[PDB]
Structure 1
Amino acid sequence: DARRKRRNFSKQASEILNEYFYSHLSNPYPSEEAKEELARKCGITVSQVSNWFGNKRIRYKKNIGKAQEEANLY
């Protein structure tokens, strides 16, 4: 159970995962090659990118009336 050894990602890596997410509002699904490269910059395993985008997709959807419109991107 790696929930016991769980730690928050680096704030820099979060700025990358959120960068891809909001910029691609139409299709929030990275390819196998994209996720392979997205994991490289953040110092995390690919499965953790999959876990993040998995968690971020649903938790985004829950917010329909909050300042979730952080699509400052550009």
Structure 2
Amino acid sequence: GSHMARRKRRNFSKQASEILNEYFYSHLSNPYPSEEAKEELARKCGITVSQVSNWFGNKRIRYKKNI
């Protein structure tokens, strides 16, 4: 777990490491991100859709599709 607090949390931490990498493995199926998608990750990991959005753009630009 290694949670910073019993309730409510900020960016970074173990949850942050998984919100990011999990998206890399879970958004492969669906190329297009959405507020609902960011919101789901934001809620389970305790991060804000804005920070979540930062990864979403990053994972899509790093993976790339066709060249």
Q: State the TM-score, normalized to the length of structure 1.
A: 0.51
Give the Cα–Cα distance (whole angstroms) in 2 for the partners of residues 11 and 63 of structure 1. Answer: 32
**Share of identical aligned residues, percent?**
100
Give the Cα–Cα distance (whole angstroms) in 1 for the partners of residues 66 and 13 of structure 2. Answer: 24
**Cα pair 1:39 1:45 within 8 Å, conserved:** yes
Q: Which runs of 4+ in 1 moved over 6 A?
A: 2-8
Residue 54 to residue 5, structure 1, CA distance change in 2 (3 Å): farther
User: 1:7 Cα deviation (Å)?
Assistant: 10
User: 1:48 Cα deviation (Å)?
Assistant: 1.0
Residue 13 to residue 5, structure 1, CA distance change in 2 (3 Å): closer
State how many pairs are aligned: 63
5+ residue gaps, structure 2? none
Aligned-residue Cα RMSD (Å) equals 6.5
Q: State the TM-score, normalized to the length of structure 2.
A: 0.55
5+ residue gaps, structure 1? 65-74
> Whose helix proportion is higher, 1 or 2?
2
